[PDB]
Amino acid sequence: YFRRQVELSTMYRHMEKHNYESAAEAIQAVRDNKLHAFIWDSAVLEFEA
Amino acid sequence: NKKEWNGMMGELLSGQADMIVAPLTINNERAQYIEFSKPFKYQGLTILVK
Amino acid sequence: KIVNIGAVLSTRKHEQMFREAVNQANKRHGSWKIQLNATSVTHKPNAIQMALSVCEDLISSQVYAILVSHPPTPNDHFTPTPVSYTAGFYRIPVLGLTTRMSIYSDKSIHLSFLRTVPPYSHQSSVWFEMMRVYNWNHIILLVSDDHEGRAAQKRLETLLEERESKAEKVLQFDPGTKNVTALLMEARELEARVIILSASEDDAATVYRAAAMLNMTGSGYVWLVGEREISGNALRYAPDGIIGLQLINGKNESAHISDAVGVVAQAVHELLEKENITDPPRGCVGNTNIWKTGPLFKRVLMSSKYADGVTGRVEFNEDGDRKFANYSIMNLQNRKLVQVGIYNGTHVIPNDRKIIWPGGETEKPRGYQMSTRLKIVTIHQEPFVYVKPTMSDGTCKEEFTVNGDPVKKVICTGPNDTSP
Amino acid sequence: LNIAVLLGHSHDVTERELRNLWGPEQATGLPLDVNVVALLMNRTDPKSLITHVCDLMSGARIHGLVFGDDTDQEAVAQMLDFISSQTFIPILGIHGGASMIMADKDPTSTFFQFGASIQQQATVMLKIMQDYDWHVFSLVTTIFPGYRDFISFIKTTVDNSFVGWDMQNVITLDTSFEDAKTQVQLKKIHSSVILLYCSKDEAVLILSEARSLGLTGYDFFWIVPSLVSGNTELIPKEFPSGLISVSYDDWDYSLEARVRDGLGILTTAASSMLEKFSYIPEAKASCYGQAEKPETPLHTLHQFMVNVTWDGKDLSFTEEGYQVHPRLVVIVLNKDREWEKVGKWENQTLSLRHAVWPRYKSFSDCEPDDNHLSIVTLEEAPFVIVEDIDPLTETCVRNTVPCRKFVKINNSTNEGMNVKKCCKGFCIDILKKLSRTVKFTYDLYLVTNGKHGKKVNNVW
Amino acid sequence: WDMQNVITLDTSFEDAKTQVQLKKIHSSVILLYCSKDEAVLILSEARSLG
Ligand SMILES: *[C@@H]1O[C@H](CO)[C@@H](O[C@@H]2O[C@H](CO)[C@@H](O)[C@H](O)[C@H]2NC(C)=O)[C@H](O)[C@H]1NC(C)=O
Ligand SMILES: *[C@@H]1O[C@H](CO)[C@@H](O[C@@H]2O[C@H](CO)[C@@H](O)[C@H](O)[C@H]2NC(C)=O)[C@H](O)[C@H]1NC(C)=O
Ligand SMILES: *[C@@H]1O[C@H](CO)[C@@H](O[C@@H]2O[C@H](CO)[C@@H](O)[C@H](O)[C@H]2NC(C)=O)[C@H](O)[C@H]1NC(C)=O
Numbered sequence A: 001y002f003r004r005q006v007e008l009s010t011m012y013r014h015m016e017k018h019n020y021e022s023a024a025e026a027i028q029a030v031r032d033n034k035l036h037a038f039i040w041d042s043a044v045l046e047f048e049a
Numbered sequence B: 001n002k003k004e005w006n007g008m009m010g011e012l013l014s015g016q017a018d019m020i021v022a023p024l025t026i027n028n029e030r031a032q033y034i035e036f037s038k039p040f041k042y043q044g045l046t047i048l049v050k
Numbered sequence C: 001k002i003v004n005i006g007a008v009l010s011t012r013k014h015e016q017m018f019r020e021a022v023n024q025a026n027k028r029h030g031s032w033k034i035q036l037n038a039t040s041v042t043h044k045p046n047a048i049q050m051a052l053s054v055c056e057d058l059i060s061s062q063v064y065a066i067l068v069s070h071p072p073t074p075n076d077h078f079t080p081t082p083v084s085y086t087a088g089f090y091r092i093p094v095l096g097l098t099t100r101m102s103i104y105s106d107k108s109i110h111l112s113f114l115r116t117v118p119p120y121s122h123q124s125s126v127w128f129e130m131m132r133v134y135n136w137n138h139i140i141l142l143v144s145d146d147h148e149g150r151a152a153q154k155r156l157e158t159l160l161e162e163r164e165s166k167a168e169k170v171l172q173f174d175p176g177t178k179n180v181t182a183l184l185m186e187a188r189e190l191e192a193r194v195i196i197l198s199a200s201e202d203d204a205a206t207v208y209r210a211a212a213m214l215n216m217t218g219s220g221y222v223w224l225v226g227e228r229e230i231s232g233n234a235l236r237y238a239p240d241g242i243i244g245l246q247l248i249n250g251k252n253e254s255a256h257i258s259d260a261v262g263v264v265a266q267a268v269h270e271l272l273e274k275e276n277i278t279d280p281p282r283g284c285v286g287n288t289n290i291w292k293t294g295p296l297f298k299r300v301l302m303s304s305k306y307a308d309g310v311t312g313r314v315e316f317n318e319d320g321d322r323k324f325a326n327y328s329i330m331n332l333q334n335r336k337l338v339q340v341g342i343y344n345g346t347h348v349i350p351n352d353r354k355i356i357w358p359g360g361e362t363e364k365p366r367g368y369q370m371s372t373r374l375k376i377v378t379i380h381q382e383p384f385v386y387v388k389p390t391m392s393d394g395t396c397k398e399e400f401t402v403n404g405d406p407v408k409k410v411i412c413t414g415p416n417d418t419s420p
Numbered sequence D: 001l002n003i004a005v006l007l008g009h010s011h012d013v014t015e016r017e018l019r020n021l022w023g024p025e026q027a028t029g030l031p032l033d034v035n036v037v038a039l040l041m042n043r044t045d046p047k048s049l050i051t052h053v054c055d056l057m058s059g060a061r062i063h064g065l066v067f068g069d070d071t072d073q074e075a076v077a078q079m080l081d082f083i084s085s086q087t088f089i090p091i092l093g094i095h096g097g098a099s100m101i102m103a104d105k106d107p108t109s110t111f112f113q114f115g116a117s118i119q120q121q122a123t124v125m126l127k128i129m130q131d132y133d134w135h136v137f138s139l140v141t142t143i144f145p146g147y148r149d150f151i152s153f154i155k156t157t158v159d160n161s162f163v164g165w166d167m168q169n170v171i172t173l174d175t176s177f178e179d180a181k182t183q184v185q186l187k188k189i190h191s192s193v194i195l196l197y198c199s200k201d202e203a204v205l206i207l208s209e210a211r212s213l214g215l216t217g218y219d220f221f222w223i224v225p226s227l228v229s230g231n232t233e234l235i236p237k238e239f240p241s242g243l244i245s246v247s248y249d250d251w252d253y254s255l256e257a258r259v260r261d262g263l264g265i266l267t268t269a270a271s272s273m274l275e276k277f278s279y280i281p282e283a284k285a286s287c288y289g290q291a292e293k294p295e296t297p298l299h300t301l302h303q304f305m306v307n308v309t310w311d312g313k314d315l316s317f318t319e320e321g322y323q324v325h326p327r328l329v330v331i332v333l334n335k336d337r338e339w340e341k342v343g344k345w346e347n348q349t350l351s352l353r354h355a356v357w358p359r360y361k362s363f364s365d366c367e368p369d370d371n372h373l374s375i376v377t378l379e380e381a382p383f384v385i386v387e388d389i390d391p392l393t394e395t396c397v398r399n400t401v402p403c404r405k406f407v408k409i410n411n412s413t414n415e416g417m418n419v420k421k422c423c424k425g426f427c428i429d430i431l432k433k434l435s436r437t438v439k440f441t442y443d444l445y446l447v448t449n450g451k452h453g454k455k456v457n458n459v460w
Numbered sequence E: 001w002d003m004q005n006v007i008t009l010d011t012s013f014e015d016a017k018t019q020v021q022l023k024k025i026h027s028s029v030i031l032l033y034c035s036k037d038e039a040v041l042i043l044s045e046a047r048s049l050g
């Protein structure tokens, strides 16, 4: 979805170097402040909040 | 010498499974190859921070 | 003035018939000063020296018509290739009349070849018409020979474009093998029962043995074969109720050649209306100057529409084949050949006979055996797929919700880990 | 072993260099009794072909057969295919109608052409378009055969493409042109690059129709294969001067070097089969007096020399027998009515002489054309954003436009390479919306004289 | 309005330079000014041009 949106290439080029296999990797990383943001559906994120 | 899929789509298109029942992302690319169903969940995208 | 006409292996009931067709071609075609001159040769089983003898006899003859007249040949090669390939040096049109391989229809290769015995791709067209009769979507394909089989698969994918349907399974392999049972099991695991068979006679006998020993002729199964599978040892080993196809007056020879010679004669006498008439040179001893009106004479032969004859309306298509031929639909009723249908090129008509199937009733087998147990795959989603190890052995913890409701768990087979 | 090279030709080539072609060659000669026979012929009728094939097979059982041709009859090679169906002998084709590409061989045939398949030619043409990134194009085919494979390979190539080509749908010709249905089929093409697959007799009618439709413009490009582009000298007058074609007919590598390479591959297969099996000479006894029950061998070089290594060139073969990596030449028609050589094709990748693509803008005489623009700019960050090409895709990101930068070696030199580089920014978007509105063509590059502009003693 | 350049003919259909003017139209609506004797030839050419 970001690869088609070429006007959002730069963030894509910022995010291509840190991609994670599973979402729980990103969850454990953002809980221990190894990240700063994540792009996800609203209902699941509010559920986990 | 071919762009190919993997994961759930790689195991579905190979016929290893029968039907994906999962939070599968409806987009333009996947429906060019397979069919979809009508969605049970409507939701957008947002940012999780600390 | 004089036109030579070449025939190869005119049979002993056709050695007079060929000269009779030469005489009838000069009968009603006007008082013009053109004459004809018949040249008939007979093979010996080496195609090299016979290709040489035929090609220099045609160079010394300077023919305008080249024919193929070999039904009673037990040689399994069935290659009239080198005479057509020699005539392609001058683009001289060769009218085959016996073979049914689509590999002869390669106009990239066979530059100057036409024939009136259309191949098994048209049997696939008949099969698509039968699909439109029975309103079927999922079919099972099985072809051994690869040269005709790629053409058959391509023709079938061209046929499926109308509904935008797709074949359920593709099967292409080495002909002659005796170990195909794994692909038959993977076809059995599929939903449909539509069997499409296009192979050699030994391969058809092999799959008949692998079918009859493995219950594949019972109820629900849909058998559908052609003409190679109803001949020879495949005809010996065929189970009953099987449905094949047959060319009406295809293997018939004398009236076939008579209608072909009438087509050639009226096409030539139409071509003599046009000017710039070239002639084949003496290409035996060093004459490589190609014949000028090759594609012109071929293009005159392409749109040669006819309705007179014994078989009836004969006309060449974009493949240069018999438009809208007659077809028989044969059944093996208790090891006996019973015709159960007829096919004009646009519709199917069943006869007064009953369609007896290898399984149960005479109705169409609704062979779409549904997947009653669906193999469901999913990914580990945290709010959606909660995953627990087994408590003691294959058991869970039967918990309730906050409102008194047991959470309906399931025995999954999830990934043990995510590391490769 | 007994290896013969025959040439039925008219081009004046002597024979003694072909006798020298074995002596210093094959320095690591693992087969001992290798005997070469070089023969030159004049007329290419099939009688002499069959006769001398039987003479050479009776001539001490020759296993290596190499033939090239100067004439343009492809079916002769097909004739050799029938010879390849009978002699059970691996035969190499070199040049001309012996080297023209056929569709599908036989398992009974062992003849090997030296050329490129139509899929490989399509790969080279789409590699040209990939190197030029002209995304808006169309496919035009006829009922000339070998066409559904062509269209299908193009469809699978676009579906497996790095670019994501915005390909307009395929318009196919059906009959001889009525100029009523066919004209409506041709009016749907407002693109700039047209791919044409037809015969040479059909191409004259098609380009005459496009000239009558005005579809032979300076913006309208034409890339045709070697199958339609025939003789290099015989060119009809109805072709645009700038007609892009690709053919492996090279003259920097002549016929003698290529038959030397074929002899190297033959001796390589012979030495490797000698390392595998002892009794190498296995052929047919005689043509005349042929009794039946042929002793079909199982020690052949047909499915044995699939790969080969010679002179650093990976000259491996495909499943049908075609070369994996041949040597293709990209040419165009010049204003001097000759097929001007432009570039060469590598093993897989592609390199051209003119990096900046020349137009040959006077494709005919009735072309008053002045709608190209030469545009220069300087790097200013909120307007001009200059980056390298993406090395992963060898393609700029599609929102950007390419330019060239005359990057020099040093201060003492005066030569520079025009490095094609990606550009976005504000004025790039201005230029794109102008080219959508004013509907012009343009050429973007950078200033290498220096800064914006300043009068230095009445010199700007 | 969006107007293509006005096509003016010389004589009846020549198949040399008249169709050069005719084939430049990829639009839909065309008005015509001729005589009834010229109209048959113009509509026959437009049928032949499709
Ligand atoms: C067609 O004309 C040829 C002569 O050009 C005839 O063929 C000859 O027939 C006689 C008698 O059988 C033979 O002795 C010659 O050897 C033949 N010459 C050949 C092969 O050209 C032939 O009779 C004519 N057509 C018929 C009636 O078959
Ligand atoms: C044909 O191929 C199959 C393998 O596909 C082999 O036979 C079967 O092999 C499976 C294991 O793959 C066994 O479970 C079966 O018991 C075998 N069946 C029989 C009867 O052999 C073997 O290579 C060939 N055998 C046939 C004719 O099925
Ligand atoms: C094949 O062709 C025809 C028609 O099927 C049949 O034989 C001819 O039959 C017609 C009447 O339909 C007669 O006028 C002819 O005299 C018959 N010819 C001969 C020689 O039998 C028969 O079915 C087959 N005959 C062959 C082998 O040609």
Ligand SMILES: *[C@@H]1O[C@H](CO)[C@@H](O)[C@H](O)[C@H]1NC(C)=O
Binding pocket: C213, C214, C215
């Ligand atoms: C199917 O074949 C198997 C082979 O073991 C045989 O046991 C069985 O009887 C057959 N099916 C039926 C229902 O007859």
Ligand SMILES: *[C@@H]1O[C@H](CO)[C@@H](O)[C@H](O)[C@H]1NC(C)=O
Binding pocket: C275, C276
């Ligand atoms: C044959 O073609 C040539 C081409 O110039 C022509 O001059 C000649 O009149 C043609 N022959 C006839 C009788 O049409």
Ligand SMILES: *[C@@H]1O[C@H](CO)[C@@H](O)[C@H](O)[C@H]1NC(C)=O
Binding pocket: C311, C312, C313, C324, C325, C326, C344
């Ligand atoms: C099937 O046979 C009839 C016999 O007259 C023949 O006209 C035609 O080839 C086929 N069907 C029709 C009537 O078109």
Ligand SMILES: *[C@@H]1O[C@H](CO)[C@@H](O)[C@H](O)[C@H]1NC(C)=O
Binding pocket: C342, C343, C344, C345, C346, C347, C348, C349
């Ligand atoms: C065959 O005959 C005619 C054409 O002659 C055709 O209209 C008709 O539909 C066909 N009928 C059959 C037997 O399918």
Ligand SMILES: *[C@@H]1O[C@H](CO)[C@@H](O)[C@H](O)[C@H]1NC(C)=O
Binding pocket: D041, D042, D043, D048
């Ligand atoms: C052409 O070759 C033949 C042998 O095939 C030979 O007899 C003849 O003299 C040659 N003609 C010339 C001189 O080119």
Ligand SMILES: *[C@@H]1O[C@H](CO)[C@@H](O)[C@H](O)[C@H]1NC(C)=O
Binding pocket: D272, D307, D308
């Ligand atoms: C060609 O491929 C084979 C494997 O099929 C390999 O063993 C061989 O080294 C390769 N090259 C040569 C030297 O033939």
Ligand SMILES: *[C@@H]1O[C@H](CO)[C@@H](O)[C@H](O)[C@H]1NC(C)=O
Binding pocket: D346, D347, D348, D349
């Ligand atoms: C092609 O040739 C080059 C130069 O010899 C070589 O480095 C490369 O490995 C070869 N492979 C490709 C890219 O086809």
Ligand SMILES: *[C@@H]1O[C@H](CO)[C@@H](O)[C@H](O)[C@H]1NC(C)=O
Binding pocket: D409, D410, D411
């Ligand atoms: C020449 O050399 C360096 C490196 O090639 C180059 O960057 C520069 O343009 C020149 N430097 C000077 C001013 O000598």
Ligand SMILES: *[C@@H]1O[C@H](CO)[C@@H](O)[C@H](O)[C@H]1NC(C)=O
Binding pocket: D411
């Ligand atoms: C570089 O070239 C310029 C002239 O373009 C000159 O003024 C300058 O002195 C040169 N620098 C060096 C490397 O001497």
